[PDB]
Amino acid sequence: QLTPTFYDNSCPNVSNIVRDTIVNELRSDPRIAASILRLHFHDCFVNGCDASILLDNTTSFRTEKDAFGNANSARGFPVIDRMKAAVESACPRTVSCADLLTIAAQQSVTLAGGPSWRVPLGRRDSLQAFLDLANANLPAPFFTLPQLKDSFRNVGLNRSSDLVALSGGHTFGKNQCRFIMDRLYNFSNTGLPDPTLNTTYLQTLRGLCPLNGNLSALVDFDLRTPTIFDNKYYVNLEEQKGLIQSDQELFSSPNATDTIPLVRSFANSTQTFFNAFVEAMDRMGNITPLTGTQGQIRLNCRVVNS
Ligand code: HEM
Ligand SMILES: O=P([O-])(O)O
Ligand SMILES: [Ca+2]
Ligand SMILES: [Ca+2]
């Protein structure tokens, strides 16, 4: 029962406030649009899009920010605080942090050249955070294709089109050397590189991520257009130039009979990818929301109201 018109009477300019915050932030941090999209993904995969990920530690629950998928990885929380403060100034006690993050994710994709659409709204904010659930639910870059599929199925995204389209989020943003070292030097305990990685690209990545190098050094997910939201992600996969294992699995796994045609169709038509990305984003945004009088309108996104 989420609806795109939820704030049309109570805070009609919310989307513009969000967009203006991201644009101002992009002036100093060109990565923030990618980081915000990822925060929304990590919100939704853990008890639904309920802003659980934004809560700080308390003595009764641990923050999801300490999860393996978030710690020293997720970023942009201060930007969310800034846009929440601005929306609170304009429409007090009205817009949930969960909806704010959803809007910010959509605006981030559009600002980077991606599709533009009106997200469903009406989510409410959780009363707790779910660290253990984050550690169980968030997929990992060394997952095989059946494990990736199971990770999406576990949160309610059954369709291979969900997985292939949402993986297109890696058409922009950055990845730490840590998560590709195995592919470059010791894949599956062979002491050898991943044979599905293009051998010329292998040499490039070894130059960026040497053995004994800084594991926190960042590499672009999309070697073609690292900052533009477009379908080049899938073109890379067809050339064996997916960056992390879970990217290339979509095209090269023995289990990819159903994902290969999707990768090819998205590589062949930007419109096909953009349509599928919006559809999959709206489904992800629909994972187990609190609505109505459930949850609250959190006033400070880091803490429950008191
Ligand atoms: C399918 C399983 C997925 C896996 C295994 C995965 C894994 C990763 C990893 C390892 C990173 C780098 C994090 C770091 O270096 O600290 C990353 C970044 C990113 N992920 Fe994914 N991810 C997945 C799905 C998604 C989805 C569904 C989205 C959004 C629709 C997404 C959007 C992003 C973005 C935008 C970044 C870059 C963030 C930044 O530069 O701050 N990913 N992901
Ligand atoms: O796939 P649905 O029916 O949970 O939207
Ligand atoms: Ca959540
Ligand atoms: Ca791109």
Side-chain angles (χ1 to χ4, degrees):
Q1 54 163 74
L2 301 181
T3 174
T5 56
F6 189 81
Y7 298 111
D8 283 355
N9 291 319
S10 55
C11 200
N13 303 129
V14 59
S15 288
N16 299 119
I17 300 167
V18 171
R19 182 182 173 285
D20 281 0
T21 302
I22 297 170
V23 170
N24 187 51
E25 189 64 32
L26 280 163
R27 286 159 174 147
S28 48
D29 172 12
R31 195 182 160 198
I32 187 64
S35 301
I36 290 167
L37 176 56
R38 192 176 179 231
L39 288 182
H40 178 56
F41 155 46
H42 282 198
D43 190 13
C44 294
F45 263 58
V46 182
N47 200 57
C49 323
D50 60 358
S52 60
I53 187 162
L54 300 178
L55 293 168
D56 281 337
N57 240 343
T58 83
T59 67
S60 55
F61 56 76
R62 294 304 89 75
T63 176
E64 295 173 25
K65 300 174 177 184
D66 291 323
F68 299 111
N70 287 320
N72 193 28
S73 187
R75 61 191 302 280
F77 301 105
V79 180
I80 304 301
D81 290 327
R82 272 177 261 295
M83 63 172 67
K84 176 66 174 173
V87 175
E88 280 300 314
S89 296
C91 324
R93 304 165 227 100
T94 297
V95 186
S96 68
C97 298
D99 278 349
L100 195 66
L101 187 48
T102 307
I103 297 169
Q106 178 266 308
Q107 291 296 309
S108 293
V109 168
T110 304
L111 279 165
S116 181
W117 77 103
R118 293 201 79 199
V119 301
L121 295 163
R123 302 168 193 77
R124 290 171 68 89
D125 296 325
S126 67
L127 305 175
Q128 57 196 332
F130 309 94
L131 172 52
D132 290 329
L133 191 61
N135 280 335
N137 282 12
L138 295 173
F142 52 78
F143 274 10
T144 63
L145 184 53
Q147 291 172 295
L148 295 168
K149 286 171 174 184
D150 283 341
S151 178
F152 275 54
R153 293 165 189 180
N154 177 64
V155 301
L157 298 170
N158 278 1
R159 309 173 183 176
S160 287
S161 58
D162 296 324
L163 172 61
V164 179
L166 289 171
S167 294
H170 296 160
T171 190
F172 65 177
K174 306 268 198 179
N175 171 71
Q176 296 179 59
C177 284
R178 186 176 323 264
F179 306 121
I180 58 164
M181 295 301 282
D182 63 327
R183 294 193 80 203
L184 306 187
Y185 303 116
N186 178 18
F187 191 66
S188 208
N189 300 114
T190 61
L192 291 173
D194 183 349
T196 63
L197 179 55
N198 174 271
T199 51
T200 302
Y201 195 36
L202 169 64
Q203 292 297 108
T204 295
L205 293 173
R206 284 176 163 177
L208 299 172
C209 301
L211 213 49
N212 298 338
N214 173 23
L215 299 183
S216 291
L218 298 170
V219 173
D220 293 314
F221 266 111
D222 181 352
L223 84 148
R224 285 178 150 87
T225 55
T227 70
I228 297 168
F229 194 97
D230 54 11
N231 76 338
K232 299 296 175 284
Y233 171 78
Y234 302 98
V235 181
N236 301 336
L237 302 192
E238 294 183 323
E239 304 182 346
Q240 307 301 135
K241 299 175 183 192
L243 178 66
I244 58 173
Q245 167 177 0
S246 51
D247 291 331
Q248 196 57 48
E249 292 269 1
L250 302 178
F251 194 71
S252 301
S253 169
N255 186 237
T257 288
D258 59 343
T259 51
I260 284 159
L262 291 166
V263 169
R264 288 185 169 146
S265 80
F266 297 167
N268 287 342
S269 166
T270 296
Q271 195 73 295
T272 301
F273 166 48
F274 279 11
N275 284 347
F277 186 80
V278 174
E279 287 179 356
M281 282 285 286
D282 282 350
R283 285 166 50 70
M284 184 176 73
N286 200 43
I287 294 170
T288 61
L290 307 176
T291 60
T293 56
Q294 306 167 350
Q296 41 176 227
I297 300 305
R298 210 184 287 157
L299 299 188
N300 179 323
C301 291
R302 292 172 184 271
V303 305
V304 165
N305 298 342
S306 46

